[PDB]
């Protein structure tokens, strides 16, 4: 199976530098060109450059010239993308991809991506706060409850409700990276208004990097 396997997620402080690897295997003939393309969360695709492994000649998008270096180790069928002077705008998933033959070309095989997060944060478990209505009109057939999972690092957290017994009507939102460099996320459930105050709703938050497990019973 033709495969491009990239190195794992990275966290780097602003001003620092990151190096991501991409190991090709299963090619009958090694690719002429490996390209690197990134994508900031929620945004579009941005081509960075490429390299021709057999001669180790890279080419670059001029907006990254002088900050990006792409290199090849033909002996291990690995290529590397190094990006220096990191800023918040560099937080993105970085992909390697082989091309149909040329440097300026379409890309047919892609690596799984490497998330690079530019943050000054250290590992930190979340604070878990209830989201509960203070009032709710009678003209409301549904009510909402939730929990705010705030100020943690790095991703991910896993949020369940009622120890996993409650899945219908749940929305766990994409986390946002705050200007503090910590993540925050909400998870909510909607219920019939008559269930509010007759049933118990507890959110369970698991954050493996900090070995944190928190249950929060949500009440007004």
């Amino acid at each position: 199976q033709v495969q491009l396997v990239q190195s794992g997620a990275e966290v780097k402080k602003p001003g620092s530098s990151v190096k991501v690897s991409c190991k090709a295997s299963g090619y009958t003939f090694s690719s002429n060109v490996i390209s690197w393309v990134r994508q900031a969360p929620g945004q579009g695709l941005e081509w960075m450059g490429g390299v021709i492994p057999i001669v180790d000649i890279a080419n670059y998008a001029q907006r990254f010239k002088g900050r990006v270096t792409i290199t090849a180790d033909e002996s291990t069928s690995t290529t590397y993308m190094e990006l220096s002077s990191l800023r918040s705008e560099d937080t993105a998933v970085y992909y390697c991809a082989s091309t149909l033959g040329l440097v300026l070309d379409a890309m047919d095989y892609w690596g799984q991506g490497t998330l690079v997060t530019v943050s000054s944060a250290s590992t930190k478990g979340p604070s878990v706060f209830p989201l509960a209505p203070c009032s709710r009109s009678t003209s409301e057939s549904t009510a909402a409850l939730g929990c705010l999972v705030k100020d943690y690092f790095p991703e991910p957290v896993t949020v369940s409700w009622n120890s996993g017994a409650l899945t219908s009507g749940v929305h766990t939102f994409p986390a946002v990276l705050q200007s503090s460099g910590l993540y925050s996320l909400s998870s909510v459930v909607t219920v019939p208004s008559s269930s509010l105050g007759t049933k118990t709703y507890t959110c369970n938050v698991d954050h493996k990097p900090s070995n944190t497990k928190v249950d929060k019973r949500v009440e007004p």
């Binding site: 695709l45 081509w47 070309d105 203070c134 009032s135 705010l148 705030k150 939102f173 925050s184 909400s186």
Partner: protein, 215 residues
């Protein structure tokens, strides 16, 4: 650099229908140097078309590409559920390679107004010097919605973040959460906290609010 502009920004269709996606380049690309990709959440892009009109290996025949010069089209003759995704064009006529901004191909359904909820900050949070106020827009369609935060009728800006769920695989709606963040000091300076929601399903914007002190 060559700029690629895709249209429409969002294409809303049903399975079985024909989808036409457009890419317009700021300069001629010839009849070759354009590719189309599909991307689903959490996955790498998948090549569909190269050389403007050639299907990539294993791509079904319902996908086709046409065009030359500045105007290119991707057609999906009969949509499958698995085709609802974001689509990008890519030009490679000269360096740097550039992509279009993407077209969101989503499932069309009847307009659905969001159910809107506001949540005051907890006393637990307040202990630590920060107050987060959260507004939930639940199960709405189409995707376009605007949240404005007001604090004693003062329109807020720069102190909120929001995120949106992927279109639901069963009911075809979206949900959105917005968080207003303020120091405890500022939070306590004010009384009325409101989130105003504008959406096609609402004859006029809906506001949910609370008063600090009663909540």
């Amino acid at each position: 650099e060559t700029v690629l502009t895709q249209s429409p920004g969002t294409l809303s269709l049903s399975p079985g229908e024909r989808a036409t996606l457009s890419c317009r380049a700021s300069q001629s690309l010839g009849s070759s140097y354009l590719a189309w990709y599909q991307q689903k959440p959490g996955q790498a892009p998948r090549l569909l078309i190269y050389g403007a009109s050639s299907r990539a290996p294993g791509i079904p025949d319902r996908f086709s590409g046409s065009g030359s010069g500045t105007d290119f089209t991707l057609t999906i003759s009969r949509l499958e559920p698995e085709d609802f995704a974001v689509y990008y064009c890519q030009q490679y006529a000269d360096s740097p390679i550039t992509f279009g901004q993407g077209t969101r191909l989503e499932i069309k359904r009847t307009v659905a107004a969001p159910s809107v909820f506001i949540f005051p900050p907890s006393d637990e949070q307040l202990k630590s010097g920060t107050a987060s106020v959260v507004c939930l827009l639940n199960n709405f369609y189409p995707r376009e919605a605007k949240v404005q935060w007001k604090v004693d009728n003062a329109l807020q800006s720069g102190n909120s973040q929001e995120s949106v769920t992927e279109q639901d695989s069963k009911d075809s709606t979206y949900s959105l959460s917005s968080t207003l963040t303020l120091s405890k000091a500022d939070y306590e300076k004010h009384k009325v906290y409101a989130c105003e929601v504008t959406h096609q399903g609402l004859s006029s914007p809906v506001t949910k609010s609370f008063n600090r002190g009663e909540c």
